[PDB]
Amino acid sequence: MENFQKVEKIGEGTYGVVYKARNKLTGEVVALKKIRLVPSTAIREISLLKELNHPNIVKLLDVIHTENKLYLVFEFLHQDLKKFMDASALTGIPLPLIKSYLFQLLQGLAFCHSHRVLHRDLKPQNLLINTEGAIKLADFGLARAFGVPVRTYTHEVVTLWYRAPEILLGCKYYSTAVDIWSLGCIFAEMVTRRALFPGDSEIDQLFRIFRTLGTPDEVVWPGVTSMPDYKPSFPKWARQDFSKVVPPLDEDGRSLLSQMLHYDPNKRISAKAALAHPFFQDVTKPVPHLRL
Numbered sequence: 001m002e003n004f005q006k007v008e009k010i011g012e013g014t015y016g017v018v019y020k021a022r023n024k025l026t027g028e029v030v031a032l033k034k035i036r037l038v039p040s041t042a043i044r045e046i047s048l049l050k051e052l053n054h055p056n057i058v059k060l061l062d063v064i065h066t067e068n069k070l071y072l073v074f075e076f077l078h079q080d081l082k083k084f085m086d087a088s089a090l091t092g093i094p095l096p097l098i099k100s101y102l103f104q105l106l107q108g109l110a111f112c113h114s115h116r117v118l119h120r121d122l123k124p125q126n127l128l129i130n131t132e133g134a135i136k137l138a139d140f141g142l143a144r145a146f147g148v149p150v151r152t153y154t155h156e157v158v159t160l161w162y163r164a165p166e167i168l169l170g171c172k173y174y175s176t177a178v179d180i181w182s183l184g185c186i187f188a189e190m191v192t193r194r195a196l197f198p199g200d201s202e203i204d205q206l207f208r209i210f211r212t213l214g215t216p217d218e219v220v221w222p223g224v225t226s227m228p229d230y231k232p233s234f235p236k237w238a239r240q241d242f243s244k245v246v247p248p249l250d251e252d253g254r255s256l257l258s259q260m261l262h263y264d265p266n267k268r269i270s271a272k273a274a275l276a277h278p279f280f281q282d283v284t285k286p287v288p289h290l291r292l
């Protein structure tokens with residue numbers, strides 16, 4: 001750690017404080033992450049992440065385990081999608097750039113999903129952009145390594161906004177579909193300039209999902225009524241038209257979103273199949289206007 005000089009506090013992540021830091025004796029600028037508990041098993045799983053390299057995955061450069069303390073050194077990105085969407089509120093992100101960001105993010109998912117690694121916690125804070133028109137996923141694989149808590153070490157409530165319905169219904173063996181779901185939510189949010197399901201508790205979150213997409217049953221989601229936190233007494237809401245959900249997203253866009261938001265994780269489109277979707281037919285890579 002004496003090998004690094006703290007430049008500034010970026011924030012408080014799930015796992016602890018995040019610093020922009022500078023490598024005192026190689027000179028590279030990095031994201032320094034202090035992980036708060038290290039168990040042999042978290043070490044082994046994090047070291048696996050070091051080989052999982054893709055241009056749309058924020059590069060894990062190193063894992064320093066010193067003392068009984070855990071530090072992760074990442075490639076530094078200067079902006080996240082939450083800031084970018086804020087800065088972009090009066091007019092919204094142009095759709096060619098939403099299409100690019102989605103297509104790149106699906107590319108990161110397809111890669112990680114092929115080696116069987118999930119994120120499980122995708123959210124605008126975890127998505128990171130550069131001046132090149134790139135977008136990248138931060139913290140991939142870390143949920144499996146450390147858990148996902150209700151509150152950060154600083155008591156910041158962890159958001160549920162992007163959580164998949166099978167997770168909220170207490171399914172314990174969720175798959176890669178969880179990441180598709182979250183990215184769908186994020187996609188709808190970039191398009192409309194509003195979070196899709198801004199829930200402030202598990203039931204509020206689940207009930208916001210239900211209200212937009214219908215209360216799921218055995219027709220749409222075989223096995224649902226038998227999931228741990230399913231209750232027969234859930235209100236039964238009818239599904240809203242998507243044309244009402246994401247104006248002014250075009251037909252290909254709404255079609256794709258709809259497949260990303262399938263209740264049944266087995267019916268939900270994969271990262272791989274989504275890249276072949278007609279929505280990406282005229283995809284381009286514009287350069288954003290970033291203020292740093």
Ligand SMILES: N=C1NC(=O)/C(=C\c2ccccn2)S1
Binds near residue numbers: 010013074076126128
């Ligand atoms: N280079 C990076 N900058 C960041 O800010 C990174 C990830 C991040 C940072 C804070 C909270 C959640 N994720 S990676």
Ligand SMILES: [Cl-]
Binds near residue numbers: 078079080083
């Ligand atoms: Cl920022």
